[PDB]
Enzyme design. Sequence first.
Site, PDB file in Angstrom:
ATOM      1  N   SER A 192      -7.167 -75.650 -40.886  1.00 25.53           N
ATOM      2  CA  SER A 192      -7.584 -77.308 -41.209  1.00 25.53           C
ATOM      3  C   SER A 192      -9.061 -77.567 -41.458  1.00 25.53           C
ATOM      4  O   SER A 192      -9.456 -77.105 -42.281  1.00 25.53           O
ATOM      5  CB  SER A 192      -6.814 -78.160 -40.080  1.00 25.53           C
ATOM      6  OG  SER A 192      -5.760 -77.710 -39.504  1.00 25.53           O
ATOM      7  N   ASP A 217       1.046 -80.675 -47.362  1.00 21.34           N
ATOM      8  CA  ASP A 217       0.190 -80.624 -46.038  1.00 21.34           C
ATOM      9  C   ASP A 217       0.197 -82.052 -45.335  1.00 21.34           C
ATOM     10  O   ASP A 217      -0.105 -82.935 -45.980  1.00 21.34           O
ATOM     11  CB  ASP A 217      -1.262 -79.973 -46.129  1.00 21.34           C
ATOM     12  CG  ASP A 217      -1.886 -79.805 -45.127  1.00 21.34           C
ATOM     13  OD1 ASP A 217      -1.939 -78.758 -44.417  1.00 21.34           O
ATOM     14  OD2 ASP A 217      -2.715 -80.749 -44.558  1.00 21.34           O
ATOM     15  N   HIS A 266       1.462 -78.125 -40.968  1.00 27.14           N
ATOM     16  CA  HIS A 266       0.196 -78.421 -40.578  1.00 27.14           C
ATOM     17  C   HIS A 266      -0.238 -77.134 -39.580  1.00 27.14           C
ATOM     18  O   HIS A 266       0.397 -77.068 -38.577  1.00 27.14           O
ATOM     19  CB  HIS A 266      -0.338 -79.621 -39.870  1.00 27.14           C
ATOM     20  CG  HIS A 266      -1.616 -79.907 -39.565  1.00 27.14           C
ATOM     21  ND1 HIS A 266      -2.745 -80.103 -40.668  1.00 27.14           N
ATOM     22  CD2 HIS A 266      -2.426 -80.035 -38.570  1.00 27.14           C
ATOM     23  CE1 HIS A 266      -3.634 -80.232 -40.008  1.00 27.14           C
ATOM     24  NE2 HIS A 266      -3.685 -80.138 -38.756  1.00 27.14           N
TER      25      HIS A 266
HETATM   26  C1  LIG Z   1     -11.610 -85.238 -47.922  1.00 27.73           C
HETATM   27  C2  LIG Z   1     -11.351 -84.923 -46.686  1.00 27.73           C
HETATM   28  O1  LIG Z   1     -11.082 -85.753 -45.951  1.00 27.73           O
HETATM   29  N1  LIG Z   1     -10.947 -83.740 -46.101  1.00 27.73           N
HETATM   30  C3  LIG Z   1     -10.862 -83.032 -44.766  1.00 27.73           C
HETATM   31  C4  LIG Z   1      -9.412 -83.596 -44.439  1.00 27.73           C
HETATM   32  C5  LIG Z   1      -9.065 -83.294 -43.064  1.00 27.73           C
HETATM   33  C6  LIG Z   1      -9.816 -82.304 -42.388  1.00 27.73           C
HETATM   34  O2  LIG Z   1      -9.469 -82.070 -41.141  1.00 27.73           O
HETATM   35  C7  LIG Z   1      -7.864 -82.045 -40.902  1.00 27.73           C
HETATM   36  C8  LIG Z   1      -7.782 -81.519 -39.448  1.00 27.73           C
HETATM   37  O3  LIG Z   1      -8.696 -80.555 -38.932  1.00 27.73           O
HETATM   38  O4  LIG Z   1      -6.610 -81.450 -39.077  1.00 27.73           O
HETATM   39  C9  LIG Z   1     -11.037 -81.795 -42.888  1.00 27.73           C
HETATM   40  C10 LIG Z   1     -11.413 -82.308 -44.088  1.00 27.73           C
END
Ligand SMILES: CC(=O)Nc1ccc(OCC(=O)O)cc1
Length: 336
Positions: free
Chosen positions: A145, A242, A285
């Site tokens: 992620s 996702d 996820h």
């Molecule tokens: C453009 C943007 O929002 N990019 C993004 C989205 C999700 C993220 O993390 C999700 C997680 O760590 O579960 C990290 C970066």
Amino acid sequence: DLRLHLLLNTSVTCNDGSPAGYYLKESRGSRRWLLFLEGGWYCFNRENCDSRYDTMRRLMSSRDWPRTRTGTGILSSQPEENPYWWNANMVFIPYCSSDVWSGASSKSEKNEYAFMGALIIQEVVRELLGRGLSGAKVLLLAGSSAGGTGVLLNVDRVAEQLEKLGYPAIQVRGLADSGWFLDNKQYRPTEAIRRGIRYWNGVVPERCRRQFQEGEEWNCFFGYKVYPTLRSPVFVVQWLFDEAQLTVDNVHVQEGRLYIQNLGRELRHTLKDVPASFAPACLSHEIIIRSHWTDVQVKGTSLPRALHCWDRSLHKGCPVHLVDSCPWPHCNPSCP
Ligand SMILES: CC(=O)Nc1ccc(OCC(=O)O)cc1
Ligand SMILES: *[C@@H]1O[C@H](CO)[C@@H](O)[C@H](O)[C@H]1NC(C)=O
């Protein structure tokens, strides 16, 4: 079990100024090293970081971390749970910088929080050199992620660091899990990344900056824009549908079906020129640190097998590019 070590360089800290760290389990006879980056979104201003500090403090501070963690999935040492790299030296790096692993800014009189994710990775590498890394053959930088995006932002810098420290024989590679997002139109984030980059003093890979230049570095947080600029080998694992992507798209079924199908087709298209990739048609996820990560298959081939095939290719019936073509979630019967 991986054992906790807090960084000896106490200038490298989590958000609240407490020292960062890493969890380690060595494998005495192995020259392979896996360094895994934890995920968990991010925060981009003081008000939004204050909220995270009330309810997600372990992602901002080490003061409450346990002394051990169990290795699961690709971090397991049991060959039944981890057919790919069960004999490797295992490192788990907790995410306590809230900066998608991009920051280089200390806490100070002008900054309530420290954002040092890029510096945390570099300091972990330095301190591991005296614990056996100096004799390594391969260093795989992996993450899930926000940690998956962090692999893309940091893998070339790790290779550059080892080269200038005098270890050009260690092959650096990357494994980016669920960190390959699209800046597409919502059904009903780029600005949040742009603001966070300034708040964090975030850094992106050098060739990608030179293409997009000042003010536009937010582009390098999107896999299909930064991947073409990288020099190290990177394997990309990505669900076609996702859950974090649908969240930032304001999706939570009537004909206006077409949106979800177009998302699956576009992400498919961005992977066409990625030779090493695993992309099942599922709504889910993360995958690589889950206990049953061996269960998912694309077109008859499991993810641990595909990773082994990638290994051989870097040295018939052992493919490395595996992308589903069915256009609806859970069309692959091995989905979680
Ligand atoms: C453009 C943007 O929002 N990019 C993004 C989205 C999700 C993220 O993390 C999700 C997680 O760590 O579960 C990290 C970066
Ligand atoms: C500690 O880390 C900081 C930040 O990366 C660095 O500037 C400094 O040189 C490091 N000190 C030592 C002794 O490694």
